[PDB]
RNA sequence: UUGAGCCUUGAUGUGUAGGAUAGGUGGGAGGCUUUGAAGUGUGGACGCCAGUCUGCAUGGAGCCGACCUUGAAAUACCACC
RNA sequence: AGUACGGCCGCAAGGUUAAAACUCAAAUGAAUUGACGGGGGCCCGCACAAGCGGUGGAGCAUGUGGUUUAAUUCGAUGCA
């Protein structure tokens, strides 16, 4: 959020502040989702994520580069 | 187009002046395959401009060209079902081509005398930042400035 | 004429098939209709410019001279 | 006049507009400019350029005050919430620091329904 | 905190020609400044942009009239203006 | 047709229990091959884009439709 420049920067990077959500939470609290769309959304969110790990787990792949 | 990178045709140098720059101009002014007519008009018009400018033959052509060749242009570049023209830069090769086409089109307008004079007038006005061609380059330059938001 | 009749005349001039030469001192009225500028200058030179007032000013800016002060505002009294 | 030395530049970046206000440190507005009212009314006022112009238009009309340093406060999700500090810096100002004062509720008022 | 008026104190008056921003008649002679300058450095204001008025600093005794070829004369006071 | 009628429950909205006449030769589940999507990915080509030149306006030529005719012989009817 706040950033101090010290003597020489010319380069103020608080756009590097993505550790704070800001954009991701402004884009989300800007609309009423549902009581249960987020429940469905998060279930979809990591039903896909676990599968991606169930693919990364299979690292013994064929097909000769 | 879709698949390849097409080749070039390398053009042939202008007879009277050993520059292929004027040869492409003759080709643009060409209509109906009548190249002898096209070169005859260009030679006569560029000669009667030499009496109106002072520069010999080719400098007085480039200083006209450099005035009407644009730098940026707007093209339809929709993304999300859009209807706005994104201003984009013009490659150096197209800059000469767009300049010649604008000069010839303006010369086919402004009907005053035979084609010899109409061409001769337009290059003289281009050489002094005044003609319809140099006005057209300003119209596209002004249409790109109005659209400078989109990049 | 007032602004209303001025606007009516400007519209009528725009919806004209023929051609017209209008002498005026109203820059705005001349700009809203003129397609060719015929402007007088000193030493009896009448510069002719094909285009409207926007592109006339743009041409002057393209080939301009460095100053901006016309008047002196001399006086009346004494 | 009043020769204020250290000012505060407030960037109100919305999805549809950008509003720039340079105040003093106590919140008294000196001048303001908007992307929409800076000749971009339409679909071009929601662009990072239109916010950059509004910052030039707002750096102008506060030159009467001789402001040297600027504490920048950004607020809102918007295209011009970054293309505005660059214009403020390019207008001779010395950006003292930058702060993102964007109101995030701690799960408070219910937002509107989404548009289908 | 203001608005209006009045009295004072300042500040101010680019035509052309003229040495250079010349308000009006003055009415008179030289005063001015040395109660520290004709200036240089500096800060603001006016600016018909030529420029003259200004708060300062060591240095502090020289700036204009008078001379006239301009319709007029030289901030060289207090004036009622 | 979880409808009507009758009970019971409810302030109501209605809930629950719960048919028949009549009518059809099916309705249905999963999966398959296609086709299609204002689904996604990749690729193409005068498909667009970049150009040049046309047609649609005018005269005439020619073919067609229609309409006329004693007959306007028959056939070809989106692209094809
Ligand atoms: Mg029931
Ligand atoms: Mg019942």
Curated annotation (Swiss-Prot), chain A:
Residues 40-65 are annotated as: Disordered. It comes from the Bacteria. Transmembrane segments: none annotated. Residues 43-56 have a biased composition (Basic residues). Pfam families: Ribosomal_S21. Keywords: Ribonucleoprotein, Ribosomal protein, RNA-binding, rRNA-binding. InterPro entries: Ribosomal_bS21 (IPR001911), Ribosomal_bS21_CS (IPR018278), Ribosomal_bS21_sf (IPR038380). Residues 57-65 have a biased composition (Basic and acidic residues). GO terms for biological process: cytoplasmic translation; ribosomal small subunit assembly. Signal peptide: none annotated. One of its GO terms (molecular function) is rRNA binding. GO terms for cellular component: cytoplasm; cytosol; cytosolic small ribosomal subunit. Part of the 30S ribosomal subunit. In stalled ribosomes contacts ribosome rescue factor SmrB. Belongs to the bacterial ribosomal protein bS21 family. Probbly involved in recognition of ribosome rescue factor SmrB in stalled/collided disomes; fusion of protein fragments to its N-terminus decreases ribosome rescue in the presence of SmrB. NCBIfam families: S21p. This is Small ribosomal subunit protein bS21.
UniProtKB/Swiss-Prot annotation, chain B:
One of the primary rRNA binding proteins, it binds directly to 16S rRNA where it nucleates assembly of the head domain of the 30S subunit. Is located at the subunit interface close to the decoding center, where it has been shown to contact mRNA. Has been shown to contact tRNA in both the P and E sites; it probably blocks exit of the E site tRNA. Protein S7 is also a translational repressor protein; it regulates the expression of the str operon members to different degrees by binding to its mRNA. Keywords: Ribonucleoprotein, Ribosomal protein, RNA-binding, rRNA-binding, tRNA-binding. Belongs to the universal ribosomal protein uS7 family. The gene is rpsG. The lineage of its organism: Bacteria, Pseudomonadati, Pseudomonadota, Gammaproteobacteria, Enterobacterales. It comes from the Bacteria. GO terms for biological process: cytoplasmic translation; negative regulation of translation; ribosomal small subunit assembly; translation. GO terms for cellular component: cytoplasm; cytosol; cytosolic small ribosomal subunit; membrane; ribosome. Transmembrane segments: none annotated. Part of the 30S ribosomal subunit. Contacts proteins S9 and S11. Cross-links to IF3 and the P and E site tRNAs. The strain K12 sequence is shown. Has been predicted to contact the N-terminal domain of IF-3 based on footprint studies; exactly how IF-3 interacts with the 30S subunit is controversial. This is Small ribosomal subunit protein uS7. The chain holds residues 2 to 152 of 179 of the full protein. One of its GO terms (molecular function) is rRNA binding.
